[PDB]
Structure formats: structure tokens, C-alpha cells
Symmetry: C2
Subunit: 252 residues, 2 copies
Amino acid sequence: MSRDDFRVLTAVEMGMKNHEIVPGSLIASIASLKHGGCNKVLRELVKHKLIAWEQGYRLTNAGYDYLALKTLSSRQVVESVGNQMGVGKESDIYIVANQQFALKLHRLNVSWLYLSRLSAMKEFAYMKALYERKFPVPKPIDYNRHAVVMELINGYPLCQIHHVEDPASVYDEAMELIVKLANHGLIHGDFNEFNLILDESDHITMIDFPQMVSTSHPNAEWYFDRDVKCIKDFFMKRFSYESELFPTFKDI
Amino acid sequence: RVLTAVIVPGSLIASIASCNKVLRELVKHKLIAWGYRLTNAGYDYLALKTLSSRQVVESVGNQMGVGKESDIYIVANEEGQQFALKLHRLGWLYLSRLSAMKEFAYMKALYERKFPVPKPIDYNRHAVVMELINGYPLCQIHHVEDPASVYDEAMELIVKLANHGLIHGDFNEFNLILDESDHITMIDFPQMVSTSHPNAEWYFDRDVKCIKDFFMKRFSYESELFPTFKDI
């Protein structure tokens, strides 16, 4: 938590963009601690498992979470961290507060810490776009490194719901979402019971933002049919509901 | 250098590049557009020049196909050895550097563990250069000598990946290439799901059903034996 400890931790990350194993000598120069004590600071961090000595030092996964959280605390976004309230396709979902929000930490010669940095950016970019285009997605608050902070949704994934008031209403809302995305030139590619959250007012909200397929893509009709088939199957399997008029590529 | 220096004002470009009309020289060539920004065509040039500088890509190519979020071209080095160039197109630009690096990382790993994937040669920006496979995607194949051998090879691939702790997530007729000796080779790896994931059984079943469905619709082959998730 000390200002010196933070300078040294940021320097291990700084030198990591040119070195796999950052030498202690390189860390000293970036941290610029004035009256030294760099190697004493490096010893604390290793014991705290924020860095690992594998000759030099490398940043641990735990140390990367600390850097991202401190930066989001610095911006007045995350003040307290709650419990891990789930797992995404390649992420860890925690509950945060400044009210209450959702923190998504992305977990995947190139280093995977940097790849996670971009995976976060991609999610924030897709979320920022769709939200502005008035789509049922959680509001993106901010992002830093592998951390994405968004609106906390009071709901459970569709896959956990065994009894629903009206399945027809819920079905129509999922199919309208597939149409709305398609008319905006996008196909989800993973539109299913795990990526959709149903809230207290029984409204669908998409929470997974993978790599979305363009409608101009040669195999777009196949990906569109797969998403429509997924909803059709789940509703017929769980709530035993069937409909004759389902979206087709002709609707787009 | 001017292209590497490149909305960016002309005054800023001058300072990085270290004169004037050079500028409309590549605006006309559509390598940059209106301050001035880099075009998708200009980004391909930067990546190709760097791969030419490393003696990996010497000649141009005919776009032989399209990936889920990429453009597949044919390349050749000074020697004349033909390779496959994959330019990542996300539809930013710095994000296409992710999909490239991520693909190269997954390809490097899977190849080393002796998986049927094209050999990764090198990567830069949104460009990934790999081994050229003499084959067509399984979706273009309507007739095949033995459907049983091809089916077994696709199902063994699903098992082999699962026992390593990975689930493809998009294992289908577009991502698999069938060569002259009728051997399956994986050409896409966008988002692989871990077997330790809570919904891994659902993703594994989806891949297995997306081979059984295709092998019935085309070829009209069905086999009693097929992979189940409670095998690892």
C-alpha cells in the first residue's frame, strides 16, 4: 500500500513490456526511489506474492489485480471489494462498491497478462457501443488493464431459472434482441442460456460479449440460425414452449 | 517512415519521421485518410513490410478465403516456399493485434503438443503467417472416399483437446480443412473454453453434435460410438 511499494510494482510491470524476467537493476531505474531501498521493497512484494523471482523479477496474477484495483481506486470507482459472485467465459466476476457494481477480471513468446489487457478493452468497446445503441447490456463504468467495471444486474442467468410467469414474453424479448443486433449488422455467435440474465421484472440482459460475426460475412446465415435454434431449444426444453414465427435471415 | 509516424496532425508526423508532399502521395494510394489517420489498407502495408524485412513474406497473394474475423491470403518468401497470411479484421485496429497474438499463442502451443494445426511461422500487428495447407474446408466437400475415417479423426481431435483441458467452442465444417490424404486440420481457435469451466459439458456436447449433424446432412454417415464429457 506504500507509495514506494507501488512505484516498484509499477516498474516491474513497466520493464515487462520489453523483458520476460525484469532484472532488479532495471526496476531500480524506473522506480527512481531517490534514497534507494529498492531491493528491500522487492523482498516485501515477493513475500506478499505480488511478484515472483524466476536473473530477475516478474509480475504475479495477484500483483496484476492489485495494480488494476489501485488505479480504479485512484479514479474513485472501486473503494471496497466484496465476494466473487461468479465466473465468465474467461473471467472472474466479483462485486464492488464506490453504490454496488460488478468487477470482471479477465483471466487467460507473448505474455498472457497483456492479452488479458486487450480482452478487457474488447469487452468494454463492445459494451460501450451496444449500450449507446440502446441495447439491454450492463452500463460500462470504466476499465483498467484486465479489469472492467460495469452496472450490477439484479438477476440470475436464464439457465438457473426453472419456473417463469410467462415464457412467451421472455421468448419474444430474446428473439427481438437477435433481430435488433442483426439489423445493426451483428451476430452474437454464442447467444444462449448462460450469456443472458433474467432480472426481477423478467427482462433479458446480455452479459457475455464475445467476438461478434458481421451479417456481411459469407457464413452469417449459419451463425444467425444457430442463435435462433439455441433460444428455440432452451424454451422448448425448460418451459416446454413452442412458436411458429421465429426470426430468419429474411427479417434482417 | 512517414507511414510509421502516422487523427494525427501533419506537424506531428514531420517530427516523428524526421518532407511536405508525402502527404497526398499515400492519401491518393489510400494508405492514409483525413489531421490524418491510418487506413486498414495502410495497416496491411506496415505489417507486410515488417514481415518482408524479416525475410518471411516476399510476394503478394490471391485472397483464398475468409476466417471468422480475418482475411486469408496466399504468400511466398524469397525461396518460393508458399505460406498462408491471415490478416485480422475486427468488425479498434490495436484490438486486431490481440486476435493475431492470441491466435499465434494458441497455434504455437497446440502445434508443439502434436495437434493437427498449421505450423506458425511468424506474426506482426494483425498479420499471422502460417503453413499453407493443401486442402479445402470440410463445408466445400460433398463426397469423400471414407466418411468413417474422417469422422473418427474429428472426434479424436475433440477428445485430445479435452484431455489437455480445452474445448474449441466453434468446432465445425468451416474451421476444419480436409487435405489430399483426407486428414483434418484445425484452422481457427477464436475463444477456447477450459474443461474446468462450469458450463464446459454444454460447450463439449455442442462441438460433438456439430460433427454428427454435418456427417449426416452431407455423406449421410452415423456412428454409434461418439465422445461423452464424463471421459475428461
